[PDB]
Write a protein that binds this DNA or RNA. Structure first.
Ligand SMILES: COc1ccc2cc3[n+](cc2c1OC)CCc1cc2c(cc1-3)OCO2
Ligand SMILES: COc1ccc2cc3[n+](cc2c1OC)CCc1cc2c(cc1-3)OCO2
Lengths: 277, 277
DNA sequence: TGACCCTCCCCTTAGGGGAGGGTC
DNA sequence: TGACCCTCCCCTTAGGGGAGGGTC
């Protein structure tokens, strides 16, 4: 080859845009063999095309352009290692993505269950699978004064283990024949976990526990301050009428229907309590 | 909560940077409940913190910010679907990454073999594993006039199946007792394939074939115009002396030692030919 | 008085999309 | 004369890093 290739020829031959070529030129990653001193036209030698091989390959695997500059120097000996490195990072993304995929699936699983609920406002008994959770004591907190900010530390944990943040906010309280909401006080407030991934060094003011597998007398409904208590009451009554034996605290889960700052807020509330007979 | 949270409080509570908060404000993704008309200070209500849940989660899975805006509207019903979509894309990246990982491994495999070669300039017989390749006829092309551009269409194929571009350039020619390089003419020029991934609708001027598994009389060495022919000669002589039977064309593979535009170019050349006894 | 917060401005990857103007 | 090529400029994700200046 005693000639030269014009920018467009190289582009058609290497399947690399002219824009890409001008950029690799500016970047001093791949500069033409000769630039016409007048027209400023870019000209390339055939032997030089070989350098685009590495460039295109590294680009395919996401290597940053400036990163390539150092790679084009090493001589097959170290280039080997360079790849072993790239492999490590590739597996990194894979593990992340696999985990992420699993998480999403679980969020959907739980999400579907709330969508296929028997009936709102009515009490019923069903067999539940255990649900793992992270809890901390309520410290006086009760139905009338809980805040989203109250779940801050809990959420920081689930977040650094799941990436995803809890979908539901939970609380518990002694099963009593209350006559008023102000008589109520939460024992614990909790958030369920998704990934059981070893919780990054948990502090002792948190407990990794579970809402055990068993039979539960439940009731779900769309939140309304004047319905919260009356629904608790249905539950209390239902258990008394069938003479059931409660063997856990009442478990309370609040999950938002939407996260739109536009529409009026609405939550799904679910109270369940483990029973025996 | 009859008060407000200052930007920094929300930041500490939601584990979201103040910068991030100001940006989500500008973007109209998450704006404070109230902005002090004088100080311009940003103030947030506790109930509002709940909207950051979706934001943080979608952000964790790579959803673009403007994309989130539409997601915060849908009500759990469609939000479910939205995730099914996200799952599809997640698997997409996974397949890609898995493939990519496999590719890199192969490039390393081949790369290592060239690094652990018996001896340069000397002829020897070894048992080889089959190597799949894509070839096209040489059309007169020979050792003295092959160009990188000659492998253009071939490379466009391997590239759209492997992402990675071939590491070695190949050619073949009839095994003859040549007396001169100018007597030589390639039958085919080829590039080996990495992924056997169904080659995207291959045109008939290309053949998907293979350098079969078998015994080969080989010789590798660092390229030098005056060594190309003399090494071919060693091969021709070696086969004559042991009275071996050649049962293929001579296979020629050229692979660059580096892709640095700084240092002098250097290639690794390997000639092999399948024999019988 | 210190932390706390605000606006403004500059910077970052790898180019794609033109626009205005010469050029094999 | 048309394609081919060049330089210049604007634009793109999600903010982080200050800088200069008021503020619970
Ligand atoms: C976003 O999370 C929320 C959002 C809103 C919530 C609203 C209420 N609770 C938790 C909430 C919660 O818990 C996590 C506790 C039970 C309750 C009783 C009431 C009432 C409001 C509430 O008005 C008077 O009687
Ligand atoms: C980057 O790829 C290259 C680079 C350089 C190459 C150089 C030569 N060949 C292929 C090459 C190739 O093939 C793909 C064919 C054999 C040959 C005989 C010769 C000679 C040069 C070459 O000088 C006189 O005798």
């Amino acid at each position: 080859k005693e000639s030269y290739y014009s920018i467009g020829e190289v582009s058609k031959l290497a399947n690399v845009s002219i824009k890409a070529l001008r950029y690799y030129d500016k970047i001093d990653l791949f500069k033409p063999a000769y630039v016409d001193p007048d027209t400023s036209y870019r000209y390339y030698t055939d032997s030089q095309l070989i350098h685009l091989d590495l460039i295109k390959s590294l680009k395919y695997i996401g290597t940053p352009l400036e990163e390539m500059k150092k790679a084009q120097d090493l001589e097959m000996e170290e280039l080997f290692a360079f790849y072993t490195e790239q492999e490590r990072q590739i597996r990194e993304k894979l593990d992340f993505l696999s985990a992420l995929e699993q998480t999403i699936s679980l969020v959907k699983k739980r999400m579907k269950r709330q969508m296929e609920y028997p009936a709102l406002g009515e009490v019923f008994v069903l067999d539940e699978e255990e649900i793992r959770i992270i809890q901390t004591e309520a410290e006086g907190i009760g139905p009338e004064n809980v805040l989203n900010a109250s779940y801050s530390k809990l959420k920081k944990f689930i977040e650094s283990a799941d990436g995803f943040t809890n979908n539901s906010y939970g609380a518990t309280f002694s099963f009593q024949p209350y006559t008023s909401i102000d008589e109520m006080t939460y024992r614990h407030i909790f958030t369920p976990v998704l990934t059981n991934k070893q919780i990054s060094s948990i502090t002792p003011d948190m407990e990794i526990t579970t809402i055990p597998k068993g039979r539960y007398a439940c009731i779900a409904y769309n939140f309304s301050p004047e319905h919260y208590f009356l629904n608790l009451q249905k539950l209390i009554k239902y258990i008394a009428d069938r003479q059931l034996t409660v063997v856990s605290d009442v478990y309370e889960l609040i999950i938002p229907i939407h996260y739109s700052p536009k529409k009026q807020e609405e939550y799904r509330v679910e109270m369940k309590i483990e029973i025996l007979d």
